[model samples]
Target: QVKLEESGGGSVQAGGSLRLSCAASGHTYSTYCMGWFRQVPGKEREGVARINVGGSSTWYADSVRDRFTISQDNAKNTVYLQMNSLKLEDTAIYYCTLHRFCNTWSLGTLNVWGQGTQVTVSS
Candidate 1:
């Protein structure tokens, strides 16, 4: 079992790049996938992408096309979600989930956990 935390700034100017990091501790880092999700200001949460530890490959949600990317640094065992063109519509709380066994079936299902962080794009 492991614990995850999301730490990042909350406000950004429109069109600026927004970078966020997810830090994890406890348990083996190479055996699971870390995924990120978004909860818009007033809407339901949505999956942004999932990154497998083995190769750091990402699977983006259909609705999250063109502005977000998932990345991982094996040396640090940290996963990050980066978004560009920080639009007003992008204000939301970003979360990172740790997959217990690197399985897609576990997504937002069971064996999944999240650490939430709020993000706002504005002055």
Candidate 2:
């Protein structure tokens, strides 16, 4: 069993950096892939970034490729999302996901997801 909880949400000044985090429990964090997603009000969810626990692979959506970064700390059993130079439109609900897979051809679905943290970007 795996559970994900996201925190570090709230308000961030425009042009400032915003750092969010997700903590995992009930499983070894190193065995799962961490995914970061965000959904603006009334819009579809967007994938911000993803990183493997092995720390060897990482990918970011083109929308966030320039401003977002994802990292994991095995010792803390946590994954982190950092966005720099935030904007007002960046305000949204963010979620962390844990996915499991069996083989290279089958990308697994998200099994554990965080409750979602609302982040507001204001002046």
Candidate 3:
């Protein structure tokens, strides 16, 4: 049974860096591309970043392209996000998602696992 679960969020000081994790199981991690998204409480999803399988390519939303990046470690079966800077309003939930062609965002149709991590940037 393929599944994903994530952790690594709680609180962070304003201007601090943030990193969150997603652990994948029931399949090989490097075979499938993955995407990361952030959603403000009660709002729509915003793209953060995504890496193609084998780390061939990636894309990000301009909204977060400057401060956010994502990568995966096949050895650990994990996909992680690194946010270089933060703000109190950055408080949101980040979700881990699976992609089909690795060329587009397809979270609603494919696998959008991960329990998701809630981040709070406090001043």
lDDT, candidate 3, 1-123, per-residue tens: 667778778888998997888876776444677767778977887767777655557787777778878887866767778887887768988888775456545444555556678898898
Q: Pick the winner on TM-score between candidates 1 and 3.
A: 3
Question: Ten-residue segment with the worst summed lDDT in candidate 1?
Answer: 105-114
TM-score of every model versus the real structure: 0.82, 0.84, 0.83
Q: How far does residue 59 in candidate 2 sit from its true spot (Å)?
A: 1.1
TM-score of model number 3: 0.83
**lDDT comparing candidate 3 with the true structure:** 0.74
Indicate the TM-score of model 1: 0.82
Candidate 2 C-alpha lDDT tens digits along 2-115: 788788888879988878999888884356677677788788877677777656477787777888888988777777888897878788898887775413212324456688
Q: Could you report the Cα RMSD, in angstroms, for every candidate shown?
A: 2.3, 2.9, 2.1
Model 2 off-target regions past 4 Å? 28-30, 102-109
Highest-lDDT candidate: 2
Q: Please give the ranking of all candidate structures by lDDT, highest first, separated by commas.
A: 2, 3, 1
Arrange candidates by TM-score, highest first: which order? 2, 3, 1
